Design a protein around this nucleic acid. Structure first.
Ligand SMILES: [Mg+2]
Ligand SMILES: [Mg+2]
Ligand SMILES: [Mg+2]
Ligand SMILES: [Mg+2]
Ligand SMILES: [Mg+2]
Ligand SMILES: [Mg+2]
Ligand SMILES: [Mg+2]
Ligand SMILES: [Mg+2]
Ligand SMILES: [Mg+2]
Lengths: 150, 51, 117
RNA sequence: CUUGAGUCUCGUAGAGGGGGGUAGAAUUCCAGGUGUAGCGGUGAAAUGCGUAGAGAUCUGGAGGAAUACCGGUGGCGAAGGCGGCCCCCUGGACGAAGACUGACGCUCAGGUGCGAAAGCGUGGGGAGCAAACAGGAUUAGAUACCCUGGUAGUCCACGCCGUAAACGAUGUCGACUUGGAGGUUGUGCCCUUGAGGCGUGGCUUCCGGAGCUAACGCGUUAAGUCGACCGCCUGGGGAGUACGGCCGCAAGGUUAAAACUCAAAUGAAUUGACGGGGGCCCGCACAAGCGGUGGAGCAUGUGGUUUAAUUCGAUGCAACGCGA
């Protein structure tokens, strides 16, 4: 409402030291248990490259290259009319959503162990498959469909 | 309001329509007339135009 | 089917709906399109985008006539008043004349009261 | 007698009035061509109109009503009111070189006439709009607001009705009283060599001084300062009602009480509060997220119910793991 600094700076990944990566290992973190989380992020990120054969980051990156949206609608209560005016998503935000989606979607894959679950979704995402990309499309589907206001 | 500009340069030139005709003349006639409302509500603009 | 190469495009920019009717310089309609039919309805068919998908759709129906150039006949306010034209020209149509034919009586019939809230 | 009032002469502006023509834009309707699956409407809808071909578009035709722009803080009129252009008939206002009459003036109970809209009678007219009415919708309901239609009417001629927040809520006539900015129209002077500048009559906006006023405000177009005549008021409700008279085709108009009852009714301004008024700001208020409650078993508190008693208290946010 008033406050305006920039963004709470985070500590890089403990293995590759990547901001984007780091925050991703946070969204997955539960009950403030950064330890267990880390193991999961790696126990899956490692398995990805184990197959993709590419660097954990360029591999992970791809997974986002799909789930990553670009435009979303923003409700604006005007004269009792709940309009859904669409708008492009800033870069810093864009990646966040992709990361949040991937996890939440992976957490529902009801596989065996979350560690492996994360891996699958991360793989499927790299080619528009899992629920990750699913939601992503819906987002853009909402927008444009409301391009009239756009 | 006629507009025929030689040399293709697809430039709308919507100034004419928005210089008199078009809206303002239509929106003015959209609903009912006026009758007594004009001799006032309209002349109530001079009370503003003055200052 | 007759090859005209150049006709005219009318646009009914009504506050609620917008329809485009492509016809030769004679008046004989060659094809038409309408926002209401172009999918979205009511709250969504009365937007500027509506006329776009409509106008462009009117071409994919008459362009089969070998049209090259075409004048524009715009009448009425509301959206799709300008939107329609753009898409039309953007479709390759060699535009030429843009004239407003919106009806404006020099004080004749009595407009309806309507709207009172 | 001439300064009031009037007449004449010559000019000036004007939607002043009555009659008759006429023009362009648009709406609707009819016919035909092109064309094809929607149109129309709303917050959404639906009624409705569409394949018996609508809408759109083009062509021709029929008809009624009103005159975009100019247009105004404008102009004319006793008021009501009066806007396209042209002709015919006709009223008033103003200026000025003056000429003429010679107080012929001001006001006016009763009287006479003019009176918006709606309404009424006879006969026309009828496009658009639209009381009634009929559907669709919204709503708890919706005899409404909104949508789809639509009769009277709105238009004309002639007769009637005579009312309105018929309002500047401010009777008419005349004389005085600082100023500022502007509009409209007549006229005089100025190298007018000029757009022009300066005067000076008529009508007209806003601001404001003195003064006036309860205050708001009015303020040379007074609600200031005076004179002439007229109209009207005497607490609120009952009541502009009843009764009677007069008028009216009718609807109703006009004149106009009393009983009973109240201690107020009312005007302006003031403070605050509120507004489904406006502007500007804050707060995990919302938005952006994370994790929950609501479902489950159990704990606990409250209500209810029960009970001989279920001790008393706290019950919107500010009671309900609260006094305990
Ligand atoms: Mg109606
Ligand atoms: Mg009448
Ligand atoms: Mg009659
Ligand atoms: Mg006058
Ligand atoms: Mg004043
Ligand atoms: Mg008061
Ligand atoms: Mg805080
Ligand atoms: Mg929230
Ligand atoms: Mg939640």
């Amino acid at each position: 409402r008033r406050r305006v600094i920039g963004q709470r700076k985070i500590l890089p990944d403990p293995k590759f030291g990547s901001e984007l990566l780091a925050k991703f290992v946070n969204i997955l973190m539960v009950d403030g248990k950064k330890s267990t989380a880390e193991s999961i992020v790696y126990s899956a990120l490692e398995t990805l490259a184990q197959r993709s054969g590419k660097s954990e980051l360029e591999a992970f990156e791809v997974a986002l290259e799909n789930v990553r949206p670009t435009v979303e609608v923003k409700s604006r209560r005007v004269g009792g009319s709940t309009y859904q005016v669409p708008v492009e998503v800033r870069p810093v935000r864009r990646n966040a959503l992709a990361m949040r989606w991937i996890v939440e979607a992976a957490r529902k894959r009801g596989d065996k162990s979350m560690a492996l679950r994360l891996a699958n979704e991360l793989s499927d995402a790299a080619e528009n498959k899992g629920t990750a990309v699913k939601k992503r499309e819906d987002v853009h589907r909402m927008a444009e469909a409301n391009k009239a206001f756009a | 309001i006629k507009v025929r500009e030689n040399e293709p340069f697809d430039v709308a030139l919507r100034r004419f329509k928005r210089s008199c005709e078009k809206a303002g003349v239509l929106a003015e006639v959209r609903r009912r007339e006026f009758y007594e409302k004009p001799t006032t509500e309209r002349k109530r603009a001079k009370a503003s135009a003055v200052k | 089917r007759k090859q005209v190469s150049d006709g005219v495009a009318h646009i009914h920019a009504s506050f609620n709906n917008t329809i485009v009717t492509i016809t030769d310089r004679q008046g004989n309609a060659l094809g038409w399109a309408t926002a209401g039919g172009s999918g979205f309805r009511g709250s969504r068919k009365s937007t500027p985008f509506a006329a776009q998908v409509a106008a462009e759709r009117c071409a994919d129906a008459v362009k089969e006539y070998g049209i090259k150039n075409l004048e524009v006949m715009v009448k009425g306010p509301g959206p799709g008043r300008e939107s329609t034209i753009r898409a039309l020209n953007a479709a390759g149509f060699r535009i030429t004349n843009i004239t407003d034919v919106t009806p404006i009586p020099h004080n004749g019939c009595r407009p309806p009261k309507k709207r009172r809230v």
